[PDB]
């Protein structure tokens, strides 16, 4: 299964405070609208590659 990553996967590249500024930086980011594999936990915990870094997200209602 795949879903749309939309605009998720952006993190603060460093610990520098900036305001009212557009800052251009090159780092390991999740490409926008890329495909991320969708796993389910109903009614599935495989081992995945790590490559050069992994973005992880989950949705919860009972802290599974």
């Amino acid at each position: 299964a795949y879903t749309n990553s939309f605009t998720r996967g952006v993190y603060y590249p460093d610990k520098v405070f900036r305001s009212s500024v557009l800052h251009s930086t090159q780092d390991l980011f999740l490409p926008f609208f890329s495909n991320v594999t969708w796993f389910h936990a109903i009614h599935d915990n495989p081992v995945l590659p790590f490559n050069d870094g992994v973005y992880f997200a989950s949705t919860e209602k009972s802290n599974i």
Binding site: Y12, K15, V16, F17, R18, S19, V21
Partner: protein, 167 residues
């Protein structure tokens, strides 16, 4: 992280994970004190330039000193928007600009004599006696001759690049 500057209190709301701030030029703007979680601004220590305002040495050896873009703190002291001017007397009377300082302030050597600083005039005020039925028509005239000097040419220099570099 090291540097030189003046540390002052600030009202910048740093986020708990942010430790340093930067300006548009990528220089350090502020830091969070690692012992007490307050934000301190970093203002580089005052710097600028020293200008000497003087009448020609054929008249007097008295000079005035302008410290550009500084306050009259770190340095007969007159604070102007051009910097801190020391040695020139501030005179309320305006005159034609003589030795320009900047930001509307000029200095000159006048009256016992000393260097003074003042806001320049720009000329005498002269209202025109305008009305809807009055015309001024010249009755006499003067023929004047003025001199306008323009550069036309410059010295035709020539440099032997090989002999200059590797003589």
């Amino acid at each position: 992280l090291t540097g030189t500057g003046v540390l002052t209190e600030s009202n910048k709301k740093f986020l708990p994970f942010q430790q340093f701030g930067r300006d548009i030029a990528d220089t350090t703007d502020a830091v969070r004190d690692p012992q007490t979680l307050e934000i301190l601004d970093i203002t580089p220590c005052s710097f600028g330039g020293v200008s000497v305002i003087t009448p020609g040495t054929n008249t007097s050896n008295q000079v005035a000193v302008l410290y550009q873009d500084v306050n009259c703190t770190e340095v007969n002291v007159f604070q102007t928007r051009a910097g801190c001017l020391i040695g020139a007397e501030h005179v309320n009377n305006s005159y034609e600009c003589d030795i320009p300082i900047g930001a509307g302030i000029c200095a000159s050597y006048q009256t016992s004599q000393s260097i003074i600083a003042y806001t320049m005039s720009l000329g005498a005020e002269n209202s025109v006696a305008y009305s809807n039925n009055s015309i001024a028509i010249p009755t006499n005239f003067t023929i004047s001759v003025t001199t306008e000097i323009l550069p036309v040419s410059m010295t035709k220099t020539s440099v032997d690049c090989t002999m200059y570099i590797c003589g």
